Amino acid sequence: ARDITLLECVGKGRYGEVWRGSWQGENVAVKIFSSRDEKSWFRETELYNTVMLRHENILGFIASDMTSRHSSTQLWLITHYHEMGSLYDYLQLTTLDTVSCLRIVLSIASGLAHLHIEIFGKPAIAHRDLKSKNILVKKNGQCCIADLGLAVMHSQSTNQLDVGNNPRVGTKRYMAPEVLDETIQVDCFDSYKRVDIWAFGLVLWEVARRMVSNGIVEDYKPPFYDVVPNDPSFEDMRKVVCVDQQRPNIPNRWFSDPTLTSLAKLMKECWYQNPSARLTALRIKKTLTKID
Amino acid sequence: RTVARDITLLECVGKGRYGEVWRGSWQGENVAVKIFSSRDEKSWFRETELYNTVMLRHENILGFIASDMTSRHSSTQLWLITHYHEMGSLYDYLQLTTLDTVSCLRIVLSIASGLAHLHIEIFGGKPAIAHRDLKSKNILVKKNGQCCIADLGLAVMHRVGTKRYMAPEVLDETIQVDCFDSYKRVDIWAFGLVLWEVARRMVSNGIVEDYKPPFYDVVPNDPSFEDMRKVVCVDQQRPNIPNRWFSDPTLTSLAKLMKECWYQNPSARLTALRIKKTLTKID
Ligand SMILES: COc1cc(-c2cncc(-c3ccc(C4CCN(C)CC4)cc3)c2C)cc(OC)c1OC
Ligand SMILES: COc1cc(-c2cncc(-c3ccc(C4CCN(C)CC4)cc3)c2C)cc(OC)c1OC
Ligand SMILES: COc1cc(-c2cncc(-c3ccc(C4CCN(C)CC4)cc3)c2C)cc(OC)c1OC
Ligand SMILES: COc1cc(-c2cncc(-c3ccc(C4CCN(C)CC4)cc3)c2C)cc(OC)c1OC
Numbered sequence: 001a002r003d004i005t006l007l008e009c010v011g012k013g014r015y016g017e018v019w020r021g022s023w024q025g026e027n028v029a030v031k032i033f034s035s036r037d038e039k040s041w042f043r044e045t046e047l048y049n050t051v052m053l054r055h056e057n058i059l060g061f062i063a064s065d066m067t068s069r070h071s072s073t074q075l076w077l078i079t080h081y082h083e084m085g086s087l088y089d090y091l092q093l094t095t096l097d098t099v100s101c102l103r104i105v106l107s108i109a110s111g112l113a114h115l116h117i118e119i120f121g122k123p124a125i126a127h128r129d130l131k132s133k134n135i136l137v138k139k140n141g142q143c144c145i146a147d148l149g150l151a152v153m154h155s156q157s158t159n160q161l162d163v164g165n166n167p168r169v170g171t172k173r174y175m176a177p178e179v180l181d182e183t184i185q186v187d188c189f190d191s192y193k194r195v196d197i198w199a200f201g202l203v204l205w206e207v208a209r210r211m212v213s214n215g216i217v218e219d220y221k222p223p224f225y226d227v228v229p230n231d232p233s234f235e236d237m238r239k240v241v242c243v244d245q246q247r248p249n250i251p252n253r254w255f256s257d258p259t260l261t262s263l264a265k266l267m268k269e270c271w272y273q274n275p276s277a278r279l280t281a282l283r284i285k286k287t288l289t290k291i292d
Numbered sequence: 293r294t295v296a297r298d299i300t301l302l303e304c305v306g307k308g309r310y311g312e313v314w315r316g317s318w319q320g321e322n323v324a325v326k327i328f329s330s331r332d333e334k335s336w337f338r339e340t341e342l343y344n345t346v347m348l349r350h351e352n353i354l355g356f357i358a359s360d361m362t363s364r365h366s367s368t369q370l371w372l373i374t375h376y377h378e379m380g381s382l383y384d385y386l387q388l389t390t391l392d393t394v395s396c397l398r399i400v401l402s403i404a405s406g407l408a409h410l411h412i413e414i415f416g417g418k419p420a421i422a423h424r425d426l427k428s429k430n431i432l433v434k435k436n437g438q439c440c441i442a443d444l445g446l447a448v449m450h451r452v453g454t455k456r457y458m459a460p461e462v463l464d465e466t467i468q469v470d471c472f473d474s475y476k477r478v479d480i481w482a483f484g485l486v487l488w489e490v491a492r493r494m495v496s497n498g499i500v501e502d503y504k505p506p507f508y509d510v511v512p513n514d515p516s517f518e519d520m521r522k523v524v525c526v527d528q529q530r531p532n533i534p535n536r537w538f539s540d541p542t543l544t545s546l547a548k549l550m551k552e553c554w555y556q557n558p559s560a561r562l563t564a565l566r567i568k569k570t571l572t573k574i575d
Contacts, residue, residue: 002297021295042344045361046337049368064361065297066340068347075344 004078006030010085015040020081027081028062032074039166040149041066041075046164047148052122057111059136059146079146087143087203088132091210091220098259098292100141101211105204105263106288107142108135112200113281115145116193123153123162126192130199131174132206132222154189161189172237173223174199177273180238184275194275200284201270204263205248213257223248247271262291299325299373305380310335310445315376322376323357327369335445336370342444346418352406354432354442374442382439382486383428386493386503393542393575395437396494400487400546401571402438403431407483408564410441411476419449422475426482427457428489428505448475455520456506457482460528461558463521477558483567484553487546488531496540506531530554545574 004021011018016033033041041064047053048061060080067074084090087104096104118124127134128150135143150170153162163186170179176198178184178191185191202223209218224232226249227240240246248267254260266287269279279287299316306313311329315322328336340359342348348356355375362369379385382399391399413420423430424446431439446453450472453462459481461467461474468474485506492501510529511519523529531550537543549570552562562570 002299004295004297006293006295038344042341045340048363049333049337049361051366051368061363063363066344066359068343068356068358071347071349073344073347 004028004030016075020083021078023062023078027083029079029081031077031079033077035073035075037149037168038073038075039164040147040168041077043151043164043166044077044147044149047125047151047153050122052119053125055111055114057107057114057142057144059144080144082136082138082144084137084139086133087135087137087207090137091132091206094210095217096207096211098211101207101263102259102288102291103141104137104143105207106285108145108200108203109281109285109288111143111145112196113285115151116196116281118154118156120157123155123160124189124193126152126154126189127196127199128152128192129170129174130196130203131171132203133171135203152189152192161187170195170199172232172234173228174202175234175237175241176275177241178275180234181242191275193281194278197270197278197281197284198275200281201267202248204267204270208254208260208263208267209251211257211260213253213260216253218251245273259291262287266291299323301325315378316373318357318373322378324374324376326372326374328372330367332445332451333368333370335443335451336372338447339372339444342421342447342449345449346421348409348418348421350406350409352402352438352440353409354440375440377432377434377440379433379435381429381442382431382433382490385433386428386489389493390500391490391494393494396490396546397542397571397574398437399433399439399490401568403441403483403486404564404567404571406439406441407479408568410447411479411564413450420472420476421450422448422472423479423482424448424475425451425453425457426479426486427454428486431486448472453478453482455515455517456511457485458520458524459558460525460556463517464525467558474558476563477561480553480561480564480567481558483564484550484561485531487550487553491537491543491546491550492534494540494543496536496543499536501534528556542575545570 006019019030021030045064062078065076115125134147301314303315314325358373360371410421430443
C-alpha cells in the first residue's frame, strides 16, 4: 500500500515545506523540496540508500521520489513523524532536569558517533548542517538527527571520499571558524567531522541553558544571539567567530552544578580554533555516558 | 490532498541482470516500471541524477514519470517509472516485422532525432548528453511509427556499454576520456550498427534479410571484449552490405550513411545533426 494523504503543513521556508501526512494509517513526515534545493534532495536520497544508516538517533527513512509531467518536477522525502517537533521548538517552552538534559545530549552524541564511524556496510558520514532545528525530539526523551542533504561520505577500506555535488553551505550561525574563513581542507574527511563537532558544542550550549540548577535557568537563545544582528550574514558570523574570537558565554551559575560544570568543559573542547584539538564524537559519547 | 502512489504490476515484459521491467497501471494509465537489481543500483542513481538536473522532454526520448526509492526490512527498492510502449523494443519488433521505405526512414530518422536532442547543448535549455549504450534493445517502437531512445543509466552530461556495440576506440582503450565529443562519437558508431539492423529488414525488389545482430557472422553469442577487439580493431571488419541494397536508392543512401558512422578515426564520423539532414533528403 503506497498512497499518502497530506493533512497539515508543519513547516515552510526556503527549503520547501514539510507536511504531516498519513500512510497505512500512521503519521509520516513528507518534505517537498524547493527546486532551488534539488541537489539536497538527491544527496539525501544517496545517503538513505544505505540500509546500515538506520539508527534510533537518525531520522528514519520511508521513501524518496522524484515525479514529473511536462516541465514540472516534484521532489519528495517521506520519513518517520515526530509530533514533539525539533529540539529548537522544544527548548523554547520547556526547561530540563539533569536526567532529561543528559538523555537529550547523549542521544545526539550517539547519533553523531553513529554517522561519523564507518561500519564494514555504512561509510563514515559527516553531516555538515548540525543544529537544533535539524534534531527532532522523540516521546522516549531521546532525539534523532535529520537532514542529510549536505552530508560527506568516506570509506577507509577503499580510500574513497564522496563530497557530493551540492553548493549549499551550512547554516551560517553554526559554521565553524575554518568554514567562515574558508580555510577548511576540502579533500580531508576529518575536516568535515570537526565541523560537526563545533556545531555539536553549540547545540550542547543551547540545551544546557535550559537545564535548571539551584532554581535558576536561562531563557532559550540561539548561539551568538548577543553579538550578531538578527538574521546574521556569513560576514557577520565571520566577524564574531574568526575576527573577535567569540565563543558562547558560560553562565556563572553553571559552576555551582557538577553536571553543568562537566558540560561547560565538554562544549569548550568542541570550540578550539584548531580543528584537530576538538574532541571526537566517540569521546563526547563516552564522556556523556560517564556524566550524571 | 490524496497522493495516489499505488502502481498495479500486471505483466513482466523483461528480466535480466539489470532487474525486471513490468507493464503496470496507475490511475487507469499504462506505465512501465523498471525494478533494479542490487547489481545495477548505480544505473538508477545516474538516470535519476540526470533527470534531477534536466527534465528531458522529447518525442524520441522515453518519457520519464518517476524515480522511486522505498525502504524495505533488509534492502532498498529502486524503481524507474516511464511511459509504456506496448509494441516493445526495436530489437523485438524487427524479429518478425519487415519494413517499407517510408517505415524504415521514419524509424531511423526518429532515432537520429532523439540522439541529436541528447547530444546538443541548449543555453538558457540542457547540457549535452551522450547515451553510451545505444542498441536496438534500448529503442522502443511507438504506435505512430516513430521510436524513442531508452536507458540513460550510463549517460554522461557536459556497468560498461554492450560489448557487441562498442566502438573501436573503446575496445582498444584509445578513447580520449577527457573529451566529451569522444562519447558522442561512440554513440554514432552504435547508431550506425542500429541503422544496419533496421535496413536489413526493409524489403526491396521482393528481397529482405533475416534479423541478425551486428557481427553475428564473426563473433559468438555474448562475445568477449577480446572477441570484439580482434574483429573491430585488429581486422577492422564492418557489417556486410548485401548486393541487393545497391538496386534500391534508399538502401544505397543508408549504406553510405552507415559507412560514415563506422570510420576507425572517431573525428571522421558524421554528427547526429548531419545524419538527420541526410535522412531528410532521402526519397
Ligand atoms: C508524475 O506523473 C504524473 C503526475 C500527474 C499530476 C497529478 N497531480 C497534479 C499534477 C500537477 C498539477 C499542477 C502543477 C503545476 C501547475 C502550474 N503551476 C501552478 C505549478 C504547479 C504540477 C503538477 C500532476 C502533473 C498526472 C499524471 O498523469 C496525468 C502523471 O503521469 C503519470
Ligand atoms: C529537519 O528536517 C526534517 C524534519 C522533519 C520532521 C519530522 N517530524 C516532525 C517534524 C515537525 C513536526 C511538528 C513541528 C511543530 C510545528 C509547529 N509547532 C512548533 C509545533 C509542531 C515541528 C517539526 C518535522 C519538521 C521531516 C523531514 O523530512 C521529511 C525533515 O527533513 C529531512
Ligand atoms: C510521491 O510519489 C508519487 C507521487 C505521485 C503523484 C500522485 N498524485 C499527485 C502528485 C502531485 C503532483 C504535483 C503536485 C504539485 C501541485 C502544484 N503545487 C504548486 C506543487 C505540487 C502535487 C501532487 C504526484 C507527484 C505519483 C507517483 O507515481 C506515479 C509517485 O510515486 C513515484
Ligand atoms: C529498454 O529499457 C526500458 C524499456 C521499458 C519499456 C517501456 N515500454 C514498453 C516495454 C515493453 C513492453 C512490452 C514488451 C513485449 C510484451 C508483450 N508483447 C506480446 C511483446 C512485447 C516488451 C517491452 C519496455 C520494456 C521501460 C524502461 O524503464 C521503465 C526501460 O529502461 C529504461
